[PDB]
Design an enzyme around this catalytic site. Structure first.
Site, short mmCIF file in Angstrom:
data_model
loop_
_atom_site.label_atom_id
_atom_site.label_comp_id
_atom_site.label_asym_id
_atom_site.label_seq_id
_atom_site.Cartn_x
_atom_site.Cartn_y
_atom_site.Cartn_z
N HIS A 113 0.82 -1.19 0.00
CA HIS A 113 0.00 0.00 0.00
C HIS A 113 0.88 1.27 0.00
O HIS A 113 0.68 2.12 -0.85
CB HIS A 113 -0.93 -0.03 1.21
CG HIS A 113 -1.86 1.11 1.24
ND1 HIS A 113 -3.11 1.03 0.65
CD2 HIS A 113 -1.70 2.33 1.78
CE1 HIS A 113 -3.67 2.21 0.85
NE2 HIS A 113 -2.85 3.01 1.51
N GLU A 114 1.85 1.40 0.93
CA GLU A 114 2.69 2.59 1.01
C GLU A 114 3.56 2.78 -0.22
O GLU A 114 3.74 3.92 -0.67
CB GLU A 114 3.55 2.59 2.30
CG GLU A 114 2.72 2.66 3.58
CD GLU A 114 1.65 3.73 3.65
OE1 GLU A 114 1.89 4.83 3.12
OE2 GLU A 114 0.56 3.45 4.21
N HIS A 117 1.78 4.47 -2.93
CA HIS A 117 1.82 5.93 -2.74
C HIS A 117 3.17 6.50 -3.14
O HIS A 117 3.21 7.56 -3.76
CB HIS A 117 1.51 6.35 -1.31
CG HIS A 117 0.11 6.09 -0.88
ND1 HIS A 117 -0.98 6.45 -1.67
CD2 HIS A 117 -0.34 5.67 0.31
CE1 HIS A 117 -2.05 6.19 -0.95
NE2 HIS A 117 -1.70 5.73 0.26
N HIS A 123 -5.63 6.79 -3.37
CA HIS A 123 -6.49 5.69 -2.95
C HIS A 123 -7.45 5.27 -4.04
O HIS A 123 -7.92 6.10 -4.85
CB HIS A 123 -7.25 6.05 -1.68
CG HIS A 123 -6.37 6.07 -0.47
ND1 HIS A 123 -6.52 7.03 0.50
CD2 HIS A 123 -5.32 5.28 -0.15
CE1 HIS A 123 -5.58 6.78 1.40
NE2 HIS A 123 -4.84 5.72 1.05
ZN LIG Z 1 -2.99 5.07 1.75
#
Ligand SMILES: [Zn+2]
Ligand SMILES: [Ca+2]
Ligand SMILES: [Ca+2]
Ligand SMILES: [Ca+2]
Ligand SMILES: [Zn+2]
Lengths: 158, 92
Positions: A113-114, A117, A123
Protein backbone atom coordinates in the site's frame (compact mmCIF):
# COMPACT_ATOMS: atom_id res chain seq x y z
CA UNK A 1 0.21 14.02 -10.12
CA UNK A 2 4.00 13.43 -10.04
CA UNK A 3 5.65 10.19 -11.24
CA UNK A 4 9.22 8.84 -11.23
CA UNK A 5 10.77 9.97 -14.58
CA UNK A 6 13.26 7.03 -14.46
CA UNK A 7 12.51 3.27 -14.32
CA UNK A 8 15.60 2.30 -12.17
CA UNK A 9 14.48 3.18 -8.59
CA UNK A 10 16.56 2.53 -5.43
CA UNK A 11 15.33 1.95 -1.90
CA UNK A 12 17.13 1.80 1.42
CA UNK A 13 15.91 0.43 4.75
CA UNK A 14 16.93 3.18 7.19
CA UNK A 15 16.36 1.02 10.31
CA UNK A 16 14.51 -2.17 11.33
CA UNK A 17 11.53 -2.88 13.57
CA UNK A 18 12.34 -5.10 16.65
CA UNK A 19 8.86 -6.75 16.18
CA UNK A 20 10.22 -8.95 13.36
CA UNK A 21 13.49 -10.68 12.43
CA UNK A 22 15.70 -8.51 10.06
CA UNK A 23 15.35 -11.20 7.27
CA UNK A 24 11.51 -11.08 7.58
CA UNK A 25 11.53 -7.24 7.19
CA UNK A 26 13.88 -7.55 4.17
CA UNK A 27 11.61 -10.23 2.56
CA UNK A 28 8.34 -8.29 3.12
CA UNK A 29 9.85 -5.10 1.63
CA UNK A 30 11.51 -6.88 -1.32
CA UNK A 31 8.28 -8.77 -2.14
CA UNK A 32 6.18 -5.52 -1.76
CA UNK A 33 8.37 -3.77 -4.40
CA UNK A 34 8.17 -6.95 -6.55
CA UNK A 35 4.31 -6.66 -6.57
CA UNK A 36 4.62 -3.29 -8.39
CA UNK A 37 7.65 -4.07 -10.57
CA UNK A 38 5.72 -7.12 -11.97
CA UNK A 39 3.08 -4.91 -13.64
CA UNK A 40 5.24 -1.85 -14.69
CA UNK A 41 8.65 -1.16 -16.42
CA UNK A 42 10.02 -0.13 -12.97
CA UNK A 43 13.03 -1.94 -11.44
CA UNK A 44 13.76 -1.66 -7.72
CA UNK A 45 17.24 -2.15 -6.20
CA UNK A 46 18.08 -2.19 -2.47
CA UNK A 47 21.09 0.01 -1.50
CA UNK A 48 22.68 0.18 2.02
CA UNK A 49 24.85 3.31 1.52
CA UNK A 50 24.19 6.75 -0.01
CA UNK A 51 20.91 8.42 -0.91
CA UNK A 52 18.17 6.10 -2.16
CA UNK A 53 15.07 7.25 -4.03
CA UNK A 54 12.75 5.59 -1.50
CA UNK A 55 13.85 5.57 2.14
CA UNK A 56 12.03 3.01 4.35
CA UNK A 57 11.83 4.20 7.99
CA UNK A 58 10.32 2.70 11.21
CA UNK A 59 9.52 5.52 13.67
CA UNK A 60 7.12 6.49 16.50
CA UNK A 61 5.51 9.88 17.27
CA UNK A 62 7.30 12.96 15.84
CA UNK A 63 10.22 11.90 13.61
CA UNK A 64 11.36 15.07 11.73
CA UNK A 65 8.92 15.43 8.81
CA UNK A 66 5.96 17.42 10.36
CA UNK A 67 3.67 14.32 10.30
CA UNK A 68 3.94 12.75 13.74
CA UNK A 69 2.70 9.18 14.17
CA UNK A 70 -0.20 8.66 16.60
CA UNK A 71 0.91 5.76 18.90
CA UNK A 72 -0.73 2.29 18.95
CA UNK A 73 -3.95 2.45 16.89
CA UNK A 74 -5.06 5.17 14.47
CA UNK A 75 -2.99 5.07 11.25
CA UNK A 76 -0.17 2.60 10.50
CA UNK A 77 2.22 4.33 8.10
CA UNK A 78 2.54 7.12 5.59
CA UNK A 79 4.42 7.77 2.37
CA UNK A 80 5.26 10.72 0.17
CA UNK A 81 4.58 10.80 -3.55
CA UNK A 82 7.42 10.89 -6.12
CA UNK A 83 9.93 13.70 -5.78
CA UNK A 84 13.33 14.63 -4.41
CA UNK A 85 14.34 14.48 -0.73
CA UNK A 86 11.40 13.18 1.35
CA UNK A 87 9.54 12.42 -1.94
CA UNK A 88 8.93 8.66 -2.26
CA UNK A 89 9.92 7.92 1.39
CA UNK A 90 7.77 5.37 3.29
CA UNK A 91 7.49 5.58 7.07
CA UNK A 92 6.05 2.87 9.28
CA UNK A 93 4.63 3.56 12.71
CA UNK A 94 6.90 1.71 15.18
CA UNK A 95 4.09 1.91 17.84
CA UNK A 96 2.33 -0.71 15.68
CA UNK A 97 3.14 -4.40 16.08
CA UNK A 98 4.46 -5.46 12.67
CA UNK A 99 3.98 -9.12 11.68
CA UNK A 100 4.98 -11.53 8.89
CA UNK A 101 1.35 -12.78 8.83
CA UNK A 102 -1.59 -11.63 11.03
CA UNK A 103 -2.06 -11.05 14.81
CA UNK A 104 -0.85 -7.49 14.35
CA UNK A 105 -0.28 -5.16 11.39
CA UNK A 106 1.06 -7.12 8.35
CA UNK A 107 4.23 -5.33 7.13
CA UNK A 108 4.03 -6.85 3.58
CA UNK A 109 0.48 -5.58 2.84
CA UNK A 110 1.16 -2.18 4.47
CA UNK A 111 4.41 -1.82 2.42
CA UNK A 112 2.52 -2.75 -0.80
CA UNK A 113 0.00 0.00 0.00
CA UNK A 114 2.69 2.59 1.01
CA UNK A 115 4.93 1.79 -2.01
CA UNK A 116 1.86 2.36 -4.22
CA UNK A 117 1.82 5.93 -2.74
CA UNK A 118 5.63 6.25 -3.16
CA UNK A 119 5.03 5.56 -6.88
CA UNK A 120 2.30 8.21 -7.15
CA UNK A 121 -0.93 6.28 -6.60
CA UNK A 122 -3.77 7.77 -4.61
CA UNK A 123 -6.49 5.69 -2.95
CA UNK A 124 -8.81 3.41 -4.88
CA UNK A 125 -12.57 3.27 -4.51
CA UNK A 126 -12.51 -0.48 -5.32
CA UNK A 127 -12.90 -2.54 -2.05
CA UNK A 128 -10.74 -5.30 -3.59
CA UNK A 129 -7.76 -2.99 -4.29
CA UNK A 130 -4.61 -2.88 -2.19
CA UNK A 131 -4.87 0.95 -2.58
CA UNK A 132 -8.34 0.85 -0.93
CA UNK A 133 -7.96 2.94 2.27
CA UNK A 134 -9.14 0.19 4.73
CA UNK A 135 -6.53 -2.15 6.22
CA UNK A 136 -7.50 -5.72 5.11
CA UNK A 137 -5.50 -8.78 5.92
CA UNK A 138 -4.96 -11.43 3.20
CA UNK A 139 -2.25 -14.12 3.22
CA UNK A 140 0.91 -13.29 1.11
CA UNK A 141 0.20 -16.50 -1.01
CA UNK A 142 -3.40 -15.40 -1.77
CA UNK A 143 -2.57 -11.70 -2.19
CA UNK A 144 -3.00 -10.27 -5.70
CA UNK A 145 -3.23 -6.72 -7.02
CA UNK A 146 -6.76 -6.02 -8.17
CA UNK A 147 -7.59 -5.01 -11.75
CA UNK A 148 -8.11 -1.45 -10.43
CA UNK A 149 -4.55 -1.39 -8.89
CA UNK A 150 -3.08 -2.62 -12.20
CA UNK A 151 -5.07 -0.03 -14.20
CA UNK A 152 -3.97 2.75 -11.78
CA UNK A 153 -0.23 1.96 -11.83
CA UNK A 154 -0.15 1.25 -15.62
CA UNK A 155 -1.95 4.57 -16.24
CA UNK A 156 1.17 6.23 -14.71
CA UNK A 157 3.98 3.98 -15.94
CA UNK A 158 2.72 1.78 -18.81
CA UNK B 1 -15.01 32.67 9.28
CA UNK B 2 -11.25 33.33 9.79
CA UNK B 3 -10.61 31.06 6.71
CA UNK B 4 -9.84 32.69 3.33
CA UNK B 5 -11.74 30.15 1.14
CA UNK B 6 -15.54 29.62 1.27
CA UNK B 7 -17.02 27.29 3.95
CA UNK B 8 -17.49 23.76 2.58
CA UNK B 9 -19.37 22.43 5.65
CA UNK B 10 -19.54 22.26 9.45
CA UNK B 11 -17.70 19.49 11.34
CA UNK B 12 -19.18 18.46 14.70
CA UNK B 13 -17.52 16.87 17.80
CA UNK B 14 -14.44 15.42 16.04
CA UNK B 15 -11.68 13.97 18.21
CA UNK B 16 -8.11 14.94 17.26
CA UNK B 17 -4.50 15.44 18.41
CA UNK B 18 -2.89 18.90 18.35
CA UNK B 19 0.56 19.36 16.77
CA UNK B 20 2.64 22.07 15.15
CA UNK B 21 3.79 22.18 11.52
CA UNK B 22 7.32 23.71 11.43
CA UNK B 23 7.20 24.26 7.59
CA UNK B 24 4.19 26.71 7.61
CA UNK B 25 4.72 27.56 11.37
CA UNK B 26 1.08 26.75 12.23
CA UNK B 27 -0.80 24.59 14.74
CA UNK B 28 -3.19 21.91 13.49
CA UNK B 29 -5.55 19.26 14.78
CA UNK B 30 -4.93 15.80 13.34
CA UNK B 31 -7.84 13.33 13.00
CA UNK B 32 -6.99 9.80 11.78
CA UNK B 33 -9.54 7.50 10.08
CA UNK B 34 -9.80 4.34 12.18
CA UNK B 35 -8.87 1.04 10.47
CA UNK B 36 -7.21 2.83 7.48
CA UNK B 37 -3.56 2.57 6.53
CA UNK B 38 -2.93 6.28 6.40
CA UNK B 39 -6.12 8.37 6.10
CA UNK B 40 -5.60 11.54 8.10
CA UNK B 41 -7.33 14.94 8.03
CA UNK B 42 -5.43 17.98 9.29
CA UNK B 43 -7.49 20.89 10.50
CA UNK B 44 -5.54 24.18 10.62
CA UNK B 45 -7.43 26.57 12.95
CA UNK B 46 -7.07 30.28 12.21
CA UNK B 47 -8.60 31.10 15.67
CA UNK B 48 -6.79 28.66 18.05
CA UNK B 49 -6.40 29.97 21.60
CA UNK B 50 -2.83 29.77 23.02
CA UNK B 51 -4.26 27.60 25.88
CA UNK B 52 -4.52 24.63 23.36
CA UNK B 53 -1.11 25.22 21.71
CA UNK B 54 0.45 22.12 23.31
CA UNK B 55 2.03 19.15 21.49
CA UNK B 56 0.04 15.87 21.52
CA UNK B 57 -2.95 17.51 23.31
CA UNK B 58 -6.18 15.57 22.68
CA UNK B 59 -9.27 17.70 21.93
CA UNK B 60 -12.97 17.41 20.95
CA UNK B 61 -13.83 20.16 18.49
CA UNK B 62 -16.42 21.61 16.09
CA UNK B 63 -16.09 24.25 13.37
CA UNK B 64 -16.53 25.49 9.79
CA UNK B 65 -14.02 24.04 7.35
CA UNK B 66 -12.66 25.53 4.12
CA UNK B 67 -10.08 24.41 1.57
CA UNK B 68 -6.55 25.08 2.93
CA UNK B 69 -4.30 27.71 1.25
CA UNK B 70 -1.04 26.52 2.91
CA UNK B 71 1.93 25.33 0.78
CA UNK B 72 2.57 22.13 2.77
CA UNK B 73 4.29 18.77 2.00
CA UNK B 74 1.60 16.14 2.68
CA UNK B 75 1.96 12.36 2.63
CA UNK B 76 -0.57 10.51 0.50
CA UNK B 77 -3.83 9.88 2.36
CA UNK B 78 -3.45 13.18 4.31
CA UNK B 79 -5.76 16.05 3.40
CA UNK B 80 -5.82 19.44 5.05
CA UNK B 81 -8.47 22.05 5.68
CA UNK B 82 -8.67 25.44 7.22
CA UNK B 83 -11.06 25.53 10.23
CA UNK B 84 -12.89 28.29 12.09
CA UNK B 85 -13.30 26.67 15.51
CA UNK B 86 -16.71 27.04 17.16
CA UNK B 87 -15.86 24.85 20.17
CA UNK B 88 -12.75 23.08 21.49
CA UNK B 89 -12.17 21.24 24.78
CA UNK B 90 -9.27 19.22 26.21
CA UNK B 91 -10.06 15.47 26.64
CA UNK B 92 -8.28 12.90 28.98
ZN1 LIG C 1 -2.99 5.07 1.75
CA1 LIG D 1 13.20 10.11 -1.33
CA1 LIG E 1 -0.52 4.30 14.90
CA1 LIG F 1 6.57 -2.04 17.05
ZN1 LIG G 1 7.01 10.36 8.46
Amino acid sequence: GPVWRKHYITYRINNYTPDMNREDVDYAIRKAFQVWSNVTPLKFSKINTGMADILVVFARGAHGDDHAFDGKGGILAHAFGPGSGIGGDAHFDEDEFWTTHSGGTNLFLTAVHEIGHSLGLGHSSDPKAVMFPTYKYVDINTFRLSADDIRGIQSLYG
Amino acid sequence: SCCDKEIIKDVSELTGIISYNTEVKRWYISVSDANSYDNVTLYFPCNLDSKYMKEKEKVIFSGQISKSTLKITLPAGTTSYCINLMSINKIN
